[PDB]
Amino acid sequence: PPPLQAVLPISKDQPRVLLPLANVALIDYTLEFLTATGVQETFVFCCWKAAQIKEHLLKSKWCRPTSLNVVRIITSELYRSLGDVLRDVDAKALVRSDFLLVYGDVISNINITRALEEHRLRRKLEKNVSVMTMIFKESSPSHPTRCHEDNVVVAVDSTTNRVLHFQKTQGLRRFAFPLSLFQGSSDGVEVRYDLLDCHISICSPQVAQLFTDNFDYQTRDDFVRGLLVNEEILGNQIHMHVTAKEYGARVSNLHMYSAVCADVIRRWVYPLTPEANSCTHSRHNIYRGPEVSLGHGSILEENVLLGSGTVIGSNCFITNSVIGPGCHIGDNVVLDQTYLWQGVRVAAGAQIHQSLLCDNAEVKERVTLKPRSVLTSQVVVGPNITLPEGSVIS
């Protein structure tokens, strides 16, 4: 049974792994995907502003003896380093075989029942030559799920798919640069730039021991940049298995929250549809919700939720934007690509566009917001004011 443990401004008060995706919290999606590929018991290693996740994940349907992936969460006050997480795992002596690690943001529908064979039998053949499998999905660049601050230039070998070199072009080089050692040996070298990291791994338990020794390693990219240049006397290999079906992330920046919670409404994860575990679908993707009273002359145009409890007013034009549970917008409101949350309340004559909001907040008359601003945590904008770009209130 695969154990597959999961590690842990606006993020000050609330954790970054309990913020809501779209009326659901990001520590439930990972519980889903790991419950989908298959996991008998999952381990949650808590990091910061903890013990609340020890209630939320104690409140959900996962906390039930009817459940399958019977969880066991661990809390560490000393391990506040975000590296060497597995040091207390091997030190605690928990796992038996074939971990599958993923840290926090995991909204994915990829099944891992086909890769685990490819690094099960393959792992067996080299009996000790392959360390881990790093799943990575295909994409083409200029897609707005690949940020400025993420890329890879990983150049694998043909016919074996072993990751030879590595980069992380987040420093945006004007010319990227693999080393001549890889092109030195001669079978066939392909340097693919297409891939986009899905941050999900299936690592052999030996990679715990490789963390115990060489204790100066912290990051995943630190580890992989380690074991492919040094350890020259037969360390391991890094073998990856690409995909073409559903994807998951894992997008930390707010710029990645924009995309990866605006494609979970547009159905791009076909079993992680918003009708999950109330709503009802409709034409042009207006996935309305129960106990909801719109107003006369409203036009809920395209690609918009409307959570359980809201009330919009007359002459509203809500479009391409979520709206949480319990809110109440007013007459002649105008939402556009925004994202409210549980218990906000805007007022009349607004012009909220391309922005955010947060929980238990409010706004009053003539408050004309602008691009990329994000009010937070019971803030209020109040009287007639037009905040400029990036006006991050607090």
Partner 1 sequence: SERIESFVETLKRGGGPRSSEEMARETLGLLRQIITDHRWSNAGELMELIRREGRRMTAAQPSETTVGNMVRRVLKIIREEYGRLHQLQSNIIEAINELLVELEGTMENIAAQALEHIHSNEVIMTIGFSRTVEAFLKEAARKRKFHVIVAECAPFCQGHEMAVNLSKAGIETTVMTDAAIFAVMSRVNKVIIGTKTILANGALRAVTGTHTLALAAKHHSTPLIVCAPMFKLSPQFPNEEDSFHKFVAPEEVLPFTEGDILEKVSVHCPVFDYVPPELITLFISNIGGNAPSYIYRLMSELYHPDDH
Partner 2 sequence: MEFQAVVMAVGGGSRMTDLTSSIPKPLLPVGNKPLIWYPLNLLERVGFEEVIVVTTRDVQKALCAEFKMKMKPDIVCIPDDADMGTADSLRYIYPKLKTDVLVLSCDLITDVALHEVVDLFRAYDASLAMLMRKRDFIGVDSTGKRLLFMANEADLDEELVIKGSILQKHPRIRFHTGLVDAHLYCLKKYIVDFLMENGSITSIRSELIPYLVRKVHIMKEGLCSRVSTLGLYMEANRQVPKLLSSAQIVSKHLVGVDSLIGPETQIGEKSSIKRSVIGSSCLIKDRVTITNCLLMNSVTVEEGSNIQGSVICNNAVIEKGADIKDCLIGSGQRIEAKAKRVNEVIV
Binding site for partner 2 (CB under 8 A): 140-141, 153, 158, 173-180, 183-184, 186-194
> Which of partner 2, partner 1, none sits in contact with 143, Cβ below 5 to 8 A by type?
partner 1
The DSSP 8-state label assigned to residue 170 in this structure reads G
- Which helix (H) or strand (E) segment holds residue 134: the answer is strand 132-137
**Cα separation, 250 vs 147, whole angstroms:** 12
Contact yes or no for 170/219 (Cβ under 8 A): no
State which residue, 240 or 347, has the beta carbon closest to partner 2. 240
Nearer to partner 2, 165 or 239 (CB): 165
Among the residue ranges 116-124, 282-290, 336-344, 356-364, the one whose residues contact partner 1 (CB under 8 A) = 282-290
Closest CA to 202 of 292, 95, 63: 95
Alpha carbon distance 255, 382 (integer Å): 27
Name residue, tokens 């006397």. Answer: 233
CB 332 within 8 A of CB 349: yes
Q: Nearer Cβ to partner 2, position 139 or 378? A: 139
Closest CA to 24 of 277, 256, 252, 271: 277
Q: Which residue has the tokens 């409010």?
A: 362
CB 153 → partner 1: shortest distance, Å? Answer: 17
Q: Which is nearer to partner 2, 153 or 311 (CB)?
A: 153
Query: Which of partner 2, partner 1, none does residue 214 bind (CB under 5 to 8 Å by kind)?
Result: none
x-or-dash string of contact with partner 1, 16-55, rule CB under 8 A? --------------------x-------------------
Q: For partner 1, which stretch binds (CB under 8 A), given 3-11, 112-120, 133-141, 344-352?
A: 133-141
Q: Judged by CB, which is closer to partner 1: 218, or 308?
A: 308
Ramachandran region, residue 170 (left: φ > 0; alpha: ψ -120 to 50; beta: rest): alpha
| Binding partner of residue 296 among partner 1, partner 2, none, CB cut-off 5 to 8 Å per kind | none
Please identify, using beta-carbon distances, which residue of 65 and 184 lies nearer to partner 2.
184
Chain positions 213 to 252 lying near partner 1, rule: CB under 8 A, are 244-247
Nearer to partner 1, 158 or 282 (CB): 282
**Cβ atoms of 74 and 95 closer than 8 Å:** no
Of residues 62, 63, 87, the one with CA closest to residue 7: 87
> Partners of 25 in the beta sheet?
20
Dihedral sign, CA of 227, 126, 118, 116? negative
Who's near 258: CB < 8 A, 6+ residues apart? none
Q: Is residue 138 near partner 1 by the rule CB under 8 A?
A: yes
Q: Interface with partner 1 includes 148 (CB under 8 A)?
A: no
CB of 33 to partner 1, least distance (A): 12
Which residues, 248 to 277, sit near partner 1 by CB under 8 A? 266-271
Closest CB 161 distance from partner 2, rounded Å: 13
Question: Where on the chain is the footprint of partner 1 (CB under 8 A)?
Answer: 36, 66, 137-144, 146, 244-247, 266-271, 280-285, 302-303
